[PDB]
Design a protein around this ligand. Structure first.
Ligand code: NAG
Ligand code: NAG
Ligand code: NAG
Ligand code: CA
Ligand code: CA
Ligand code: CA
Ligand code: CA
Ligand code: CA
Ligand code: CA
Ligand code: CA
Ligand code: CA
Ligand code: CA
Ligand code: CA
Ligand code: CA
Ligand code: CA
Ligand code: CL
Ligand code: ZN
Lengths: 396, 276, 276, 276
């Protein structure tokens, strides 16, 4: 991996710095690294595999070294460098693609493709140089049992789930008490509804609780918390739990009461925010506990009092909602996020070459299934393929 | 079921709808049509029940499922009404002079009630909650109420002299009495002629629909003056003949049953649940 | 220009509202007022039509554009009423005894009906869907129906003996008959006295509004028991003097017309759909 | 809270037994004792009810919670007995001549029966499954049955001649009829004198216990010949003096109530299953 990353980095530096007219002193160290790579790779035969529709490709390396005697790079030098760079970049892209479409139940972190296994031999270790990218930095840290960190803008941490729970229900579904929620990528939109508006509830208060257990621990997380769940604020016709019938939701939104957001780590409350909205910081957590209350307004104007009778039928249903949005976070594990393209790249490569479903990832690289069952083996394989994809994105 | 009544039920908002269960509901349920005697008199046919059953069969109800029960008038039907089968459709002829009696009958048969005996000869009684009423029915109900105070002394009525009590009903075949809550009341009732029970309104009754034949929207199934709900089970139609009414009931039976829900039927046909 | 083809319309937001077209419509449209004879009798003036025309001219309607059509009573007006103005307002007096007839008239004029002929002597007839009814009109309609079974035999009736049939109308001048769908009925109607037609309710009729003078909300323009829709075209006004009724009608003609729309079925976009 | 849905319960072992709830149940529940008239006749005391109430109060039952309902004899008590207390104990005297009637009464009160109406004049009836029976009750029930074949023709009977029918009851005040399942029967019943109902046995009724006073084990509350189950709610006592019977009942009220359970159907959980 470090050798493959170093090949990609050397090629990227060559493409960026070996330009017509540039001082040789701008590329002397780069040219030394490039020539070392050529010497190491010369005489070696590589094969990128035939898994799926990915074609079998054979790679032979017999290239001359780049010159050193020029003071400013000219057209001839740049064309020779470009030819060598193009062949090497094609090789690196094919190796990355071959590694991305492969998965092992056991050594998911270890290289899977023949080319990358060969690159892990000692004779190629000399190619290794600056490992500065975030993904390769975390890869090296993970080779040494060191604390890893991946920063995610809007991490895709919650698997998709649009579900509801009824605490009070009847076959007629006309006096209901419960919770609706959508847990999208970085979003938790939850809403507790009471059809009776807590007319018969003790103290005229109905408590609602939502617990979201994250599959990985998030640290240094910025969360925007808003007092309304717009997703559950319009009339809906909703299937029953068994799907045997449909019920009617006609929410009227009330201000959530006694809003308490707890961010917990291993069952211990790390952060607590009461009646706070806007930006909040959750420094280290793996569980979110949103507790809110529907309080019946003790003083009601005639229209409000008209909405909420003392008995059935209940035509307007009281609802209190919260929205939680993780804008940024840090995770010790790789995750999909709104900013990077690693998941997109791996999925695209797997789809383009018709890679049959393997024993590790879910079919089609579906993120919801993958994050629902984010196991250690899946974590190893996913970090491997994401690192390879980041290496490939340097060149392709 | 009972031990898990206080347990959550979780459902996904993407679970595919099941097929229509209306056919299975009809093939396994029983329907009762309550109509007044004047309806059968004006129809003036002895086989009309067979014709209606056959029309219902055309509409999907197996032969034997639909039943027809007759009642003389609103007053008589109110004396301990009995709801016999899974779906009860009550055709109530409207009369502008009996608005309160229609309201009382609709309140009794469109809501669940939990009633207890009232020994008015021995104890004073209170209505603890807005859901608490006193439902009395029989051949003739005449209820006189004397509100008391902390010392049991009647207010505007001497306890011994019933003649000074306050009249709330006279010769009623059914009456739902609602007095001020938190005040003990002495009651004089014609117990020999009619029985009074202390009842609590549990909630709506889904298996009973009331179709008001002719008239306007006058039913008030809730004692609260500020609310006069018109639920989906309170229908109203215009009529010149009863055959048209019955054909309308048969043709739109699917819609009528849609307005009603299953599982609301009780083993007993009584209009309330009695605890002694 | 492309008639008989339904082309999707793909408008957008932010197109900006056009100016009020109310003045242009009043300038280019005609308004018919339908009132009972007792209205003119109580007004007792030979120039009241001219004064109302002038008052409407104060509201924008050009002189000679508002027409005043008179009818004896509801029954006489229910004899195939023809409403030919761009906007029609029917001042209908309320009567507690004629609720169903009022409802039938409103249903007939507040909705669009595609009617085809019925020859009860030649064919048996069934109502295919909930929008199919039998509308009969004339001097006196008496409809008797014999439902048949799959063996083309009467149910509770003999196909040869019309005395055993079931009466759904008597001496009516307009009646809308709804029978159970999917059943063939033999019909005995006084064809010499009135005509029956098989009519499908296409939808609302938008240029006709009904103002119920006095009374309560009793109209039911839908055969469904579960639905009694009060559309914006059904007004209700309490009254003592017909002059006040007409002053209210003229003073809120803006609101009355706003509650109505140009008849879709009688404009060029309806060409080769059913008419015009 | 979640009514109408069967939620699984996932209890565990080692949760530790709770304390005795017997005292709380006696404090909060009511007990009805049903005894024959001859019991009171032999006791011959006008305060025996008060003494038994006091004796029950010694056993934990609050005063005014134990009721004493009287019935003339088994036949009269089998006329739709209404057992409304939280716990019902029926002291039933044994008669060698009334074995089947005793069995029928016990089967009717020791079990739960979901009953729907029967209109023998209009429809033919069949018993679908082994839990389906016909229960008839009233002043006198005489049921005659004509089995039919697939050609809706009587078997050993003429549908038009009820004299050829087969008699299954005569002058009964309560009878449970079990006919061959899957066969349509025409029925001739004295509808004017008594009422019949199509009843499904849902299961045991737990708040009702029957103490057979004298005699042997002769009850059979199951139509199955192969089964004669003696449930824990069927006690038998040998007797000479009714005072001894009542002293035994009060002294072992703990055991009697232990043999019973709160009516599973009559409590909040059964809401939208059948009642409450
Ligand atoms: C439901 O309807 C579908 C479509 O007609 C049919 O295939 C299926 O068998 C039906 N039954 C169930 C249980 O889905
Ligand atoms: C529309 O109305 C505005 C203001 O009422 C007026 O100035 C204008 O001339 C009218 N016509 C058009 C075409 O905008
Ligand atoms: C239960 O019984 C025990 C012993 O009989 C007694 O000490 C205790 O207070 C009772 N109550 C509870 C709640 O354990
Ligand atoms: Ca009354
Ligand atoms: Ca007084
Ligand atoms: Ca009260
Ligand atoms: Ca009210
Ligand atoms: Ca008419
Ligand atoms: Ca007939
Ligand atoms: Ca029809
Ligand atoms: Ca209607
Ligand atoms: Ca018997
Ligand atoms: Ca015989
Ligand atoms: Ca049987
Ligand atoms: Ca047996
Ligand atoms: Cl963003
Ligand atoms: Zn549900």
């Amino acid at each position: 991996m470090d050798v493959l990353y170093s090949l990609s980095k050397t090629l990227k530096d060559a493409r960026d710095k070996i330009v017509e007219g540039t001082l040789y002193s701008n590329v002397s160290d780069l040219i030394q690294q490039f020539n070392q790579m050529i010497i190491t790779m010369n005489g070696n035969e590589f094969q990128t595999g035939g898994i799926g529709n990915l074609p079998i490709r054979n790679w032979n390396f017999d290239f001359g070294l780049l010159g050193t005697t020029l003071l400013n790079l000219d057209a001839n030098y740049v064309e020779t460098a470009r030819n060598t760079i193009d062949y090497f970049v094609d090789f690196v892209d094919n190796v990355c693609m071959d590694e991305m479409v492969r998965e092992s139940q056991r050594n998911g972190i270890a290289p899977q493709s023949d080319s990358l296994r060969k690159l892990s031999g000692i004779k190629f270790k000399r190619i290794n140089f600056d490992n500065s990218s975030e993904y390769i930095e975390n890869w090296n840290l993970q080779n040494r049992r060191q604390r890893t960190g991946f920063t995610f803008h809007k991490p895709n941490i919650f698997p998709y789930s649009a579900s509801f729970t009824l605490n009070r229900s009847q076959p007629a579904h006309d006096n209901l008490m419960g919770t609706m929620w959508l847990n999208a990528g970085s979003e938790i939109q939850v809403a507790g509804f009471d059809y009776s508006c807590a007319i018969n509830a003790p103290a005229n208060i109905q408590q609602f609780e939502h617990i979201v257990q994250l599959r990985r621990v998030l640290t240094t997380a910025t969360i925007t918390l808003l007092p309304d769940a717009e997703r559950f604020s319009f009339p809906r016709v909703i299937n029953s739990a068994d799907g045997a019938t449909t019920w009617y939701f006609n929410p009227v939104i009330l201000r959530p009461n006694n809003v308490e957001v707890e961010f917990l780590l291993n069952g211990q409350i790390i952060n607590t925010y009461q009646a706070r909205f806007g930006t909040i910081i959750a420094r280290n957590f793996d569980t979110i506990r949103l507790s809110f209350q529907l309080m019946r307004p003790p003083n009601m104007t005639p229209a409000v009092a008209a909405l909420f009778p003392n008995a059935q039928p209940f035509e307007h249903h009281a609802t209190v909602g919260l929205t939680l949005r993780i804008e940024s976070a840090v995770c010790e594990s790789v995750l999909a996020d709104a900013s990077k393209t690693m998941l997109a790249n791996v999925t695209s490569v797997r789809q383009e070459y018709a890679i049959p479903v393997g024993p590790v990832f879910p079919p089609g690289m579906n993120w919801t299934d993958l994050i629902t069952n984010y196991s250690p083996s899946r974590e190893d394989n996913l970090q491997r393929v994401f690192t390879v994809a980041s290496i490939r994105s340097m060149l392709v | 079921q009972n031990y898990g009544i206080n347990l959550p039920i979780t459902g996904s908002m993407d679970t595919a709808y099941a097929n229509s269960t209306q056919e299975e509901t009809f093939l396994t349920s029983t329907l009762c049509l309550y109509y007044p005697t004047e309806a059968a008199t004006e129809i003036n046919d002895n086989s009309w029940k067979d014709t209606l059953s056959q029309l219902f069969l055309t509409k999907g109800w197996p032969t034997g499922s639909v039943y027809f029960k007759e009642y003389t008038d609103i007053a008589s039907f109110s004396v301990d009404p009995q709801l016999y089968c899974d779906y009860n459709v009550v055709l109530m002829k409207y009369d502008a002079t009996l608005q309160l009696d229609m309201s009382e009958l609709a309140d009794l048969i469109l809501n669940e009630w939990l009633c207890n005996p009232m020994d008015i000869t021995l104890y004073y009684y209170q209505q603890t909650d807005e859901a608490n009423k006193w439902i009395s029915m029989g051949s003739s109900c005449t209820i006189k109420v004397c509100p008391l105070n902390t010392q049991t002394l009647g207010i505007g009525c001497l306890t011994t002299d019933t003649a000074t009590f306050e009249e709330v009903a006279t010769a009623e075949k059914l009456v739902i009495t609602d007095v001020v809550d938190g005040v003990n009341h002495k009651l004089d009732v014609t117990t020999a002629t009619c029985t009074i029970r202390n009842c609590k309104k549990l909630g709506p009754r889904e298996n009973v629909a009331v179709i008001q034949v002719g008239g306007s929207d006058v039913l008030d199934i809730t004692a609260d003056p500020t609310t006069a709900p018109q639920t989906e089970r309170m229908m109203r139609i215009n009529w010149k003949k009863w055959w048209q009414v019955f054909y309308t009931v048969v043709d739109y039976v699917n819609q009528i049953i849609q307005a009603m829900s299953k599982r609301s039927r009780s083993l007993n046909s009584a209009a309330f649940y009695y605890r002694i």
